[PDB]
Amino acid sequence: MKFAEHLSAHITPEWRKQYIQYEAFKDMLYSAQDQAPSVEVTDEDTVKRYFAKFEEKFFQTCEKELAKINTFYSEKLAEAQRRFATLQNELQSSLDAQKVQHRNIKDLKLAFSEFYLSLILLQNYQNLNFTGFRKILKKHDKILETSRGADWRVAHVEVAPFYTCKKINQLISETEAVVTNELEDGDRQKAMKRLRVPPLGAAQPAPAWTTFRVGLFCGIFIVLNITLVLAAVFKLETDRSIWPLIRIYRGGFLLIEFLFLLGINTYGWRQAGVNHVLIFELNPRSNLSHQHLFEIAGFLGILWCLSLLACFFAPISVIPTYVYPLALYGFMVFFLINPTKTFYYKSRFWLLKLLFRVFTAPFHKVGFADFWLADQLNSLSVILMDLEYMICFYSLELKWDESKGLLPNNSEESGICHKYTYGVRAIVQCIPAWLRFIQCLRRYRDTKRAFPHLVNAGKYSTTFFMVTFAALYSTHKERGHSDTMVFFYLWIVFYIISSCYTLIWDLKMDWGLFDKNAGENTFLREEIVYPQKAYYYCAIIEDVILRFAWTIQISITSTTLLPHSGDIIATVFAPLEVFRRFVWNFFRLENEHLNNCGEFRA
Prior knowledge:
Order of helices and strands: HHHHHHHHHHHHHHHHHHHHHHH
Oligomer: monomer
Distance between the termini: 39 Å
Structural class: mainly alpha
Strand content: under 5%
Helix content: over 70%
Number of domains: 2
Number of helices: 23
Largest sheet: none
Shape: globular
């Protein structure tokens, strides 16, 4: 409870195998103590021999661990020295050539800032390794009631190069001096702010106010949800088409669920050790933990619930009901594009910059963050459809001259908005598929490698064909023309091939599972990061079920049952799709952390 969790939390995720392995030492010590022959029943020679053998084994494995630590530290120090030499030569050449430039200076600053992080991590590694060598030896001395542990510590631990080397501190001082004198023209305070690192990993507690705000937004959200359910059961005039209301408000709920599940994903990545900071190319000093995502999700969900309640209750009769969704979505879009440096300025503007590069894909280099956001869009494709439906409902169908808005009279109300219109919903349902397809094409063009990339481009071509044939079949269905059966069967077969193509790809390369090097972990990867093995199997089963999702509905649709059956299926499968994306992110990030899965770093 003191040093086991301290080591498990302050460890560097990429260097886990290079630490002291405190837990194994503790378990071995406890097992050896518990397996003593007898206090008095057996001879004193027997127990002395047992203790001597255990002492020899403990010192042998301790020597092995110390040698491993020494070799790792020496290799890391050599790498740091080489990197410092190359970076200093680059700076010397650039400064002489100086006599655009701002971009070069900023890149040099970033390179210096990242090099300082490596030195800090190495220093932390040294400090953590000595602390564990003093604790485990102390525990050995106490458990066996001996003093040879302290003698071994004095003899070996404070002789190895991993403890007597001071070049890391000298390197840090030289780096700080170089940054202060060459990059900032004095002003050590500004240089130190850029270079200094906070406690990283799971070692940083979230501020109390952020957790309090998360709790406050969660409780208000729960109470508002209960009130919304009660109002739906009791209020509402029954004979009004509520379908536009929850079709418009479906996108907000999907966004709220996505943000909550993304916060859970961030928490899981932080705890399991799979670092999303390096994969997403974020600065390790300042990051968004799960608490910030939870707070954002809670605030936006509170706004969504308030707008829905205002729609149900209509507190003020001078304002028509349809203003509330407009106000809610205007606030949602104004929060994102807030020009002031308030309310998560850096995160929101990084997101906006990424959205600019994800919506103009072929003209930008494809990193992980922009690839990661066009894969997340595929699951939030109902949000775009909801936005288009809201725009077409307000601009074409809504009767602005009459007080009641989104809830009109039930009889014969059908308008283009709820149909494949003239094909608008089809292209708005592939837009994310188009973005991913063109991103894959750009990656293939830039790299030249067409396996990871010519493949994974037809995965979204299957979505293209799926949506196109669904649109054709539906359009032939409403007008009553013939040849619908052929289009129905083409829709069926293309959904089959699309689900099989992205299901095999999901488990083979995106997740890394089903590899010939499974070993003990049957049907799993050679090395797993998440603690329990049951998570992977349940995730595989759920992904199989949740990806083949059209099956459950078609049956419902085939029965139809006489209600608006399709709308009940897509308002009960969209959250399932978001949950599937949330569970897919975990293993995508884990595979990328373990074995560069998409080749986004070299």
